[PDB]
Design a protein around this ligand. Structure first.
Ligand SMILES: [Fe+3]
Ligand SMILES: [Fe+3]
Ligand SMILES: [Fe+3]
Ligand SMILES: [Fe+3]
Ligand SMILES: [Fe+3]
Lengths: 348, 347, 348, 348, 347
């Protein structure tokens, strides 16, 4: 386990990579459920870098219909919704350390538009240490991003039966390499992956959750296959046994056709993230960045796409990483059988 | 997540539904393992309603042979057993907010017999907020109870193979609608369901735990079927694969034939409870009232029944909700394929 | 003693008097030394009034040369000095509940000038309850302020030998009635008094600390007389025995001729404040608002006057209430032998 | 659950069995993640027995590459590595209560070599109460030990297809019966089992994890079989469906052939431990001594063996108990179909 | 006030003055009453300097007959008396940060004889910051010590009537400059003063506590004079008004003639310490190192001298600083009218 002293040293490293120095102001955003050891380490480390530091504490926002403790489960209103003063309190900072998980939401976008940069840090200290961000991780993700920006389409195949086509061009490519060095940029310690969105009403085919694939926020390894049939950018069919029935029930609960929309699509570039990691944890340990970032995954998501100017505001959000996939940009392979093959400068 | 201010507001709402005002005294019952946020919310809410409040703290009571942290798992002695002074300090109050989970017991029965009412509140704040009680839930539950009170039998059928018959008449109906408004009432925030017990030595047939059905306190979704054979009110056969072997091994550990007795039988009337909720939580988050109360479930239980004056006092306790069942009172359906059909006022 | 539930109810009362409702944003300002019970009561009461609430936490600022724990002791820089982001986080709010004691500083002044109002709340809960603010206190203090705003001079006599003259006109009158209802305005729960500053270089004569008079932050009842001789707005002589020597030593330690300047002058209008209260407390309990506000005192201060555009930024600050005084505005008595006599509408 | 009073009485019972009295010194070793109720009960109980007591707190040692919170998962350096002062602070004591889980290490070995005794106590109080140690447990385990010490081979068979042979003689028998009564003794409250190591490069055959068998630290009941092929003391094949792929991916993570080595092999003598217990718990509750200790299990381990002077110091460590096994010492059965049959004096 | 981050930085500064680096082990010694913020800052500062750090927690030791919370008040047994294992756990370390205050004792003497050095840090963080140690303070104190080691007598006069003679030679000089850089060194953050002991049975004359002089641990400014008559090293007369009566009654309570023995004698070299500071604090804020160390004081003490091998073991312990004194070493003034004059290097 990580000592307090070590956790402060980790935050000094990551805040330095985030370009925090005596010219910079740092806001540590927190709520009653934020990890106090992480809040303290962030506040202390920023002071040690001679930054101007303050904490902003928001009362927790409850979604009555939300189930489970995972903050990614319910993307609706947040503690900032209608709270312009608190938003201005974050906009005043050069860098916000988010320890409460501001959903990508309209208010977070305006903060980023002022040139404030935002670093999410919510995973437990031991997970923060295993995937301590590096400039080399930035280099590899940005190399990958060069290909993604150039792509007119993304295609996924797998032996299990994935056969999925996403026309690209309408939406930007987004990177997460673990540190918030650029003004107006959001990132997540820990991370190391990239994604875009398909063009409106355009994603088509089949995505198969094989045995051993993951649904977040369920934080289960599939023991039975689930087939997702996609037409015009929407899931139209969810087929399998029990796990398929559980997924259909959960998605129906929200009573909104928007939950079936395909949102972000991309691949994982983090070799310190591990597909096996989730099964050594309890659900409430964190949001499982290991499952989202692991090297060579294909990661897709469902529901809201508001954050890049899409139509869909729906709260129901799933992140689904698939293993063993072939991933093409315009029929050049970036991943084959779950190993990163291109570009050469993105490989571990 | 639920803020401290919102949790106090929720306790104000539920204590009002529970008829707490400045004439009433409230005892907040806790042990070392009680959620301090919930305790503080109940104490503050009661003071704001100008009630006469105090907290009662008991040393935790340990069952040395009990496995796991779920306090429904081992039904024996409580912190109240042989503690008459502690029992009288709770009897003094109009309303007890139980944050430590006093199991049903002759001591809790005696508290309720003084007219004191008891509200259990142990689930996490977020769950308490999702199933915040309503007068509407009490009306629907009492509409169901009217039908159950007059029933002479209960019958369960499922496509998976359930075919279960329980003659009624010997035992009363119990409601749980989330609040403790009546003197001598016990209730549980959250809830929204009702049950009774089968006549002695009478329950008969097959109950199939299908893929997806749940055992409490294991808190797992069955990935294989378990077939229960029941004769004269007792499970005489448990068949299937691994889940069946696990359940057999767990029930044998108590070395007590009373573990196999069918206790309460009922259905769920809580639409804000969800069959899917359990899979989003860790085991220690709570006792999973979602699984017990979700709308259209059939809920049966095993082990002790001395809370209704039955013969069995065994500590081994299971709660097993089944989905997609047909539930009949005397050949009138109250649930079909897991949807509540009757009475209309309960839907 | 005061329960948590009662402390929250007191904050609902005071924030309502302070015009907090669903149209308003409230920042609760704190540091590590703030009372957590008061912070929580403020945060919760604001939430109950449906205000948009957030807390702002600043790292404690230390004055190495400062002695004792009394924040009023050392009026130098604060946690806001060169922390413009933190200052903007406070300016964002309609009302700041100050639980860390932002001295009267160029920064507080700037926040007030944006329209933000500020309520200081640092005394212990039992003291907050004894002097829970009323609209009637506001009425009495504003009735007194009418006469002060009409005055061209202030004069103090006492049997012990006070004979003190202060020309007025250059500086404004300031009230503290316990709540922050008016935009751009600072107040302190608890209070109930008013003051102004003498014209530059003009205050003259003698102020005598009699047996039983008080020096803050020493928090002592004088057991020997101290005579202060004042010329052209400055103490030129401090005479007596031991208490006089202690005071000379304390003031000399600051090595700054500015500490001897007379700052604010006024009288006490709080009958719920008591001259005897300090003797029932330890020093660290609070800053002793009873000694500042008690009905019919004459209160004068030394040192900094930067807060109203005076020349003196000096950190050494004393507050000295005198009992049994005759206090005049021009030829009119407002207090005689320590009883408030005018105006009639200011009396208890 | 277990009250603070009952926890103190339990620690008095176990410290008495551990020969703590007024002649003895007890050190309670802790880190930031230690259960404070257990530390307090150990300190209080040692003082009730009139022993001299002190607590030693070490900073947490982190393994950056370790996954999950289970400290048995990663055998490397510890907080004692390069920390002779802390080692000597524990050597000063007659008995160390370890509430932080000092892994078997050269430094711990040096503590025991001085004569100091070590009791590990990290499982939750309720688990500590259910397997509260008895003199009778020690008797039964030592009776098993007298057979194990002279055995020349150990053999395992099951219906599921285990057929495993381990030549013995190179390595000692180790017992755990729940208390530290003898000088230089290490034991773990709770326990009740025993094991050896196979001769170097000698273990041969097949171990089948049947449906229901367990891997620690994964804390899963297998839902399909895993077949392990062992040649010359190493796993050379891992076969099944999902569990097998997950196990293979976990083990290859460490990029070290030592991970596949068979370490300790033994059987369980704790009837108060239960194979069903793990399924009622969350992963972070404890290390699941129930799974290691249950009466009639076969427990084998993988990875490091330097604790007995073997060659392997690899951090990757698995404990794997099997049910329903026949266990032979030479051609004398000690367990048949997961039931303990010999010695007679070892049975429950 | 001092932030957590600044308090760690202060410990970094003082541990570096104390020669803590990657090579050194640090034991942070605490009990239940130790300031957790100061303990945490010492642990974090030591880890940041890459020292091998551990904390040692001892059960508190109580003197049933001691009055007040000041631990200088009652010199006897400590948490280390009869706890050899705890003593060895501290001897294992290069440096001990004492946050619980071990009184001088045969056990602490034994720790220092191993080469272990000990830094006392128990005053509040704001006091630690006002008197943050400097090498300049060490140089000035050591300049004074050079002169003291050569002195054959110490003499005090004051206009208030002090006329006190102490022959020297028998006992060493002790410095406190705020940091534990040398092995076997004990020191105290904060400090900045030095003292010795009078030859056995030799101290003679009068010490007058003027109006404004202080008794520790009473922590009062005298409002009336107290005259101490001293013969052959012992207070024989205590005269004055109410402070004298209180002092007589306090010293009689110990029922022990050793309480009247004169122990250490010395002068203050800390200008950042202030005679006025005590009057701004509550008694429980700390020991009042300000009163002990302020520049140009004369500091004498009563009771035990066992720590330099004197005969007196008595627990009753007073520290009394006098203002405006003339202090002479054999004819050379080191202080005149409370101003440090010699050596020039010490000013
Ligand atoms: Fe997503
Ligand atoms: Fe039940
Ligand atoms: Fe003032
Ligand atoms: Fe092992
Ligand atoms: Fe002394």
């Amino acid at each position: 386990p990580v000592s307090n002293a070590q956790l402060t040293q980790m935050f000094e490293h990551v805040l330095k990579l985030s370009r925090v120095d005596e010219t910079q102001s740092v806001a540590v955003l927190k709520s009653h459920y934020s990890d106090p050891r992480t809040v303290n380490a962030a506040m202390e480390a920023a002071q040690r870098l001679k930054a101007k530091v303050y904490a902003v504490e928001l009362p927790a926002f409850n979604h009555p219909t939300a189930m489970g403790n995972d903050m990614t489960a319910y993307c609706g209103d947040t503690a900032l919704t209608g709270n312009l003063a608190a938003q201005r309190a974050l906009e005043a900072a050069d860098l916000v350390v988010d320890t409460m998980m501001l959903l990508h939401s309209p208010e977070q976008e305006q903060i980023l538009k002022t040139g404030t940069r935002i670093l999410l840090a919510v995973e437990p200290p031991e997970v923060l240490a295993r995937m301590l961000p590096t400039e080399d991780d930035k280099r590899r993700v940005l190399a990958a991003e060069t290909l993604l920006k150039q792509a007119r389409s993304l295609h996924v195949r797998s032996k299990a039966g994935s056969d999925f086509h996403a026309p690209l061009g309408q939406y930007p490519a987004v990177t997460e390499y673990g540190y918030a060095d650029e003004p107006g940029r959001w990132d997540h310690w820990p991370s190391g992956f990239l994604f875009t969105w398909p063009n409106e009403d355009s994603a088509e085919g089949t995505l198969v959750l094989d045995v051993g694939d993951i649904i977040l926020p369920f934080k289960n390894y599939c023991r039975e296959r689930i087939t997702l049939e996609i037409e015009k950018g929407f899931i139209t069919g969810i087929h399998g046994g029990f796990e398929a029935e559980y997924l259909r029930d959960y998605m129906k609960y929200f009573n909104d056709p928007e939950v079936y929309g395909i949102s972000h699509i991309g691949w994982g570039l983090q070799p310190r993230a591990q597909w096996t990691a989730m099964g050594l944890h309890d659900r409430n340990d964190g949001m499982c960045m290991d499952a989202r970032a692991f090297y060579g995954n294909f990661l897709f998501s469902t529901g809201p796409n508001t954050e890049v100017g899409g139509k869909r505001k729906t709260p129901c959000h799933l992140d689904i990483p698939l293993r063993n996939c072939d991933i093409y940009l315009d029929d050049k392979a970036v991943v084959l059988a779950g190993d990163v093959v291109a570009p050469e400068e993105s490989r571990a």
